[PDB]
Design a protein around this ligand. Structure first.
Ligand SMILES: [Zn+2]
Ligand SMILES: [Zn+2]
Ligand SMILES: [Zn+2]
Lengths: 214, 214, 214
């Protein structure tokens, strides 16, 4: 009604100046990544090559920072990436909210060949190791998910470390290290054992096809 | 900041050319459906009459296709529809990812008078029968939900067939046919027994009112 | 592809004329609130001072109304606010879908200093009392959540009243008053005991910083 205006704006933007961010940062996005026009990418974000960011995803590095998404990974529709404050006001380092991967600090670290499937969320401090599938509507927060893992749909990892090569059964919310330690292993015969590689192959190809439409 | 540009684009678009999609398709949307400007609808999609598609929904038919949404159905805010690859690269048919309804093949089939309530998701291969309510934040994947069903909020159906007229209690994740077979029946006295008809009546009327604003 | 057009529109709009809404309403938003350009705010909505509304949130007051969001509260990315019909067609009051707070009627009432964290949802009829954190992916519907509460991530409150100062453990879906009555108390040592105040401080400051970018 009356169409207030026409709402003009860029969906890829710098974060705002705040008490913890004196110097604004703009996303560093590989020329081969595809960012949908209806996705949002704000602030100190690194996006790797051949990544596909789908409609309605929101990657916002304005509190905890930086947020990194490795090569050939995909951030599906409605996926949110955001993180707890990583810097104080007396100095910086709020170490409990900072994750460390290959000698570098991140608020959120999403490795290479990782699928963040539709409506999932990874909230920092968090790390997700290469070749892992984070299923539809799943949730990772204050956790480190190893490589070659599978979070089935609606699973969650909160305050834990998921060892390499394990999976979390659909609907299960893992909140203790004891339970993370006991998760089942991905084997050749497991139902999601080949899911991530298929999804990554598909999404690298969708990123290229969509790049050819812009 | 600096407003990179002004991000110009159409929210109703064709899917990209890929190895499994040599010929791009654009959505076929009944003139009486309403697509919110902040919803996204991509690729080989059929949208029926009087359907309301709300803000932030994402209907994306660029992998598995086609995605159909029957007459007088509604796709609420933040709802995602997407599907696994339905075609190979040696020919087409990836039959396990294709659902069959009234002699036609679909990646996702949403019947008539179906409510996909806010932030729910239906991921193909999947079918949802007429007059069913898919509740807020619910999830359907690799499943066939019968007609006159009710997925309460946060329920899920994965790899199963939900018989006609049953409901899934809030929060319950159904992953086996044994459990789907035992779901409770919708009766006149059940709390969500009249919910879908009310929602459909409302949403057909919202679609018309919103059409009068464009 | 072919970019149908350029999709021009306002993300802050009036609700449509319907059988239950003869007179359209436009949002009343305090000059100090920040509404992201990729959020949607429709209809009879009141937004308080210093509120931050993030990308992909959808606040839609076109069925049940009004929807109020108190001062210094935040509506994070992908959060949906919507509500069941509050008025009939023979008169108005559908009292079971109307919540009452300080002598005023609302379809959804979000108090002051409340955090609706990413991808959560509050569906009316519902009220959320001051200083409460509604966690990531959580859900509140047909419920009254007291003040100083914490809904951990993926918790839910449906058809219940959550007493003041209690929390709901991650993943738990509370559907009966008996269970709401037995929830645990927020104590100084509880893991989310200081979470809301931190989040509100942060989000008031982000709202101001983002306002300085528009
Ligand atoms: Zn956050
Ligand atoms: Zn998908
Ligand atoms: Zn609703």
């Amino acid at each position: 009604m009356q169409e207030i205006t026409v709402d003009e704006f860029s969906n890829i933007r710098e974060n705002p100046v705040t008490p913890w961010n004196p110097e604004p940062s703009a996303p560093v996005i590989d020329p081969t990544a595809y960012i949908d026009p209806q996705a949002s990418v704000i602030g100190e974000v690194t996006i790797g090559a051949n990544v596909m960011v789908s409609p309605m995803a929101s990657i916002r590095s304005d509190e905890g920072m930086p947020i990194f998404v490795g090569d050939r990974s995909n951030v599906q529709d409605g996926v949110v990436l955001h993180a707890l404050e990583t810097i104080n006001e007396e100095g910086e380092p709020i170490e409990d909210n900072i994750v460390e991967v290959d000698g570098k600090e991140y608020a959120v670290y999403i490795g290479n060949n990782v699928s963040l499937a539709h409506q999932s969320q990874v909230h920092g401090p968090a790390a997700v190791g290469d070749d892992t599938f984070i299923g539809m509507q799943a949730f990772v927060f204050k956790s480190k998910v190893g490589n070659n893992c599978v979070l089935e749909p609606r699973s969650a990892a909160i305050g834990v470390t998921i060892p390499d090569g394990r999976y979390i059964p659909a609907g299960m919310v893992v909140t203790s290290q004891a339970e993370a330690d006991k998760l089942p292993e991905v084997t050749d015969d497991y139902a999601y054992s080949h899911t991530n590689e298929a999804v990554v192959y598909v999404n690298v190809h969708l990123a290229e096809g969509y790049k050819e439409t812009s």
